[PDB]
Amino acid sequence: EDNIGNQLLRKMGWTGGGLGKSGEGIREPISVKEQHKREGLGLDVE
Amino acid sequence: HMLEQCINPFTNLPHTPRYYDILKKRLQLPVWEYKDRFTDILVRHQSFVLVGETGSGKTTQIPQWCVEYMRSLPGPKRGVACTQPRRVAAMSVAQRVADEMDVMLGQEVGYSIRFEDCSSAKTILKYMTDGMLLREAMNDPLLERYGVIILDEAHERTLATDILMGVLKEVVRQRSDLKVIVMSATLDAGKFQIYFDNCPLLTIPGRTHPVEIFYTPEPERDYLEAAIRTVIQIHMCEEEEGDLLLFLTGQEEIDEACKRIKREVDDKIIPLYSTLPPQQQQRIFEPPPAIGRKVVVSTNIAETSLTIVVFVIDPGFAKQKVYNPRIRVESLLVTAISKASAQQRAGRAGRTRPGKCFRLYTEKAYKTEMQDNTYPEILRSNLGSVVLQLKKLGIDDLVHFDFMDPPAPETLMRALELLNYLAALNDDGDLTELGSMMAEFPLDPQLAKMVIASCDYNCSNEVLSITAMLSVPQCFVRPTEAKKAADEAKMRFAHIDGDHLTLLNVYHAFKQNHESVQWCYDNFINYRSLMSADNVRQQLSRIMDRFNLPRRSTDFTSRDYYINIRKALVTGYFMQVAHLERTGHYLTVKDNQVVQLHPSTVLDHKPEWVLYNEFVLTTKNYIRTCTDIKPEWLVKIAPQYYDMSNFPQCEAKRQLDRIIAKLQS
């Protein structure tokens, strides 16, 4: 990726996987479940 | 052992009668049974973890014991620091501990929050936000002002707390005398232990009564209606005297509920949020008034930060500020709490005696939908400000930095990308002089760059005022029952070019009417927000003087007065621009998010290009605080971001291509 953020990350020694001391971090950002208005918890499932 | 005559060691005078009345009460806190065991660990280990439930007394008593430890050491008297995730917690617990030590708040005991340092040279115990302590480390890498640093409320896993744990783990490898204490309300499977090299653990048993949990038979269609329905059903169908605690997500949701609860019962309501004035906030402690009861409609401030209550209503939601690095969007979001958060809300009912928690969701929704633990804030935050402070601290390698939970690599890319676009980092990742200067401003990197760059546009005075207004709560008072009157008063300050300049008009008129409270009432302006903005502006101006950044204004009689201020906004917020589409919609540049102007804007027309301060993510996407700008300014002021060789080919690039071709004619 020619993005400047990718380059600067590669210049810190990033080699491919997750971050951290042992490379144990998550390799993709997490997703937050969307809340529709004031629907009570669990209403989406049904 | 040190000689302790029955006098105040800070005044060499006998203690007051109130000191001994408070001393009798806190000696009954469960932590005091473990003072010798706490002392034995503190004098033999550099770091350890202290787990104790809410109400055990860790927050008030443990830092006082560490002051006792510091006073016994020989040499220059260092202080004790105890961090709190919430600025309201730091202020309230500092005033309480100041009473327990019989000293004035701001003297021996003080607090330090962003834009309000209530400490002096006599301060030896300071309750501060975790963000403020990390801020102090930039000018004090080893935090040599403190001999004991206490990270409280570590279970909430705020971004600043996680960074501090990573910084402090590096500091103790270089300072041998520093004591670090990580305090948490839950065990968290010994995660803090393993992180600090299998350090000791001291657990204080909880004194919380049994709590009955009630689940709804089916999911609720509207959790606010269920909350109002449950509040009135507790009031009449319960014979045990008791108070109510309702957890809602934000201020608007609280005032709405307090209004409807009053209307339906009339056929003690106590709000509590962060920006609520402390005069109204202290009403949660006043006694209750057919059984008369107290209902506290609060946010998760009361989940663990403080204690008050036999019945708890848990809708199961909280408001979090999340960041999507894919589309570079940061927004406040209402989201379901964790099973750990739910247990902490239910545990607040079993304080005085056995209580009841009414969870407005089914049992299967609790077990099969709610996560066990809440995501660490570092996994859902914009890291640009944290990365800048770390590089200023001297930490170059953020890949192998020992995070407790490392962030995703894409989130760190966006942080490095942001700082490079602002010229805070060069193309080698090195901190630049401009970046080092930006790190000293307690602002977002976008605001810090905006302030510094405005000096060249000869309008740093006006950007400084706007920056102060953007750093305080909402200045426009808009009562629900008087929207038309409030909006009419707001439009008296409206600038045709948008909301940023409208904030400037409000500040200028506030000053020229001599900070009048009656003037604020007349114009539906929040007096407390404006006094806060005035205080913030003074402090930011003191940072300007330190770096010899000139504070300048353009001639007001000139057309360039408002044009220069709008150009200055682009220096910091060139990445938050939306382009008007042929059919009246707005599309954010690059990221191509479909947005519309927030209804609160003063814009009476839709400019072709708007710069916005805030992304509001509800049912639709709104951009709030918007200013009319010229697209030519975008390509001239921030060409590294508006790079046409790399710009995505949407409709925004088509208009930008014409401008750049016309520039080269």
UniProtKB/Swiss-Prot annotation, chain A:
Widely and constitutively expressed. Expressed at lower level in colon, peripheral blood lymphocytes, lung and kidney. It is found in: Nucleus, Nucleolus. Changing residue 19 to E: Abolished interaction with DHX15. Changing residue 14 to A: Abolished interaction with DHX15. Residues 1-46 form the G-patch domain. Enhances the ATPase activity of DHX15 by acting like a brace that tethers mobile sections of DHX15 together, stabilizing a functional conformation with high RNA affinity of DHX15. Involved in the constitutive silencing of the interferon beta promoter, independently of the virus-induced signals, and in the inhibition of the basal and cytokine-induced iNOS promoter activity. Also involved in the regulation of IL-8 transcription. Interacts with NF-kappa-B. Interacts with XRN2. Interacts (via G-patch domain) with DHX15; promoting the RNA helicase activity of DHX15. This is NF-kappa-B-repressing factor. It comes from Homo sapiens (Human). The gene is NKRF.
From Swiss-Prot, chain B:
A motif (DEAH box) lies at residues 152-155. GO terms for molecular function: ATP binding; ATP hydrolysis activity; ATP-dependent activity, acting on RNA; double-stranded RNA binding; helicase activity; RNA binding; RNA helicase activity. Changing residue 58 to A: Abolished ATPase activity without affecting ability to activate the MAVS-dependent signaling to produce interferon-beta. The modification N6-acetyllysine is found at residue 364. It comes from the Eukaryota. Pfam families: DEAD, HA2_C, HA2_N, Helicase_C, OB_NTP_bind. The keyword Transport does not apply. It comes from Homo sapiens. Changing residue 152 to A: Abolished ATPase activity without affecting ability to activate the MAVS-dependent signaling to produce interferon-beta. Ubiquitous. The keyword Cell inner membrane does not apply. This is ATP-dependent RNA helicase DHX15. Changing residue 219 to E: Abolished interaction with NKRF. It catalyses: ATP + H2O = ADP + phosphate + H(+). ATP binds at residues 52-59. Belongs to the DEAD box helicase family. DEAH subfamily. DDX15/PRP43 sub-subfamily. It is found in: Nucleus; Nucleus, Nucleolus. Keywords: Acetylation, ATP-binding, Helicase, Hydrolase, Immunity, Innate immunity, Isopeptide bond, mRNA processing, mRNA splicing, Nucleotide-binding, Nucleus, Phosphoprotein, RNA-binding, Ubl conjugation. Changing residue 361 to E: Abolished interaction with NKRF.
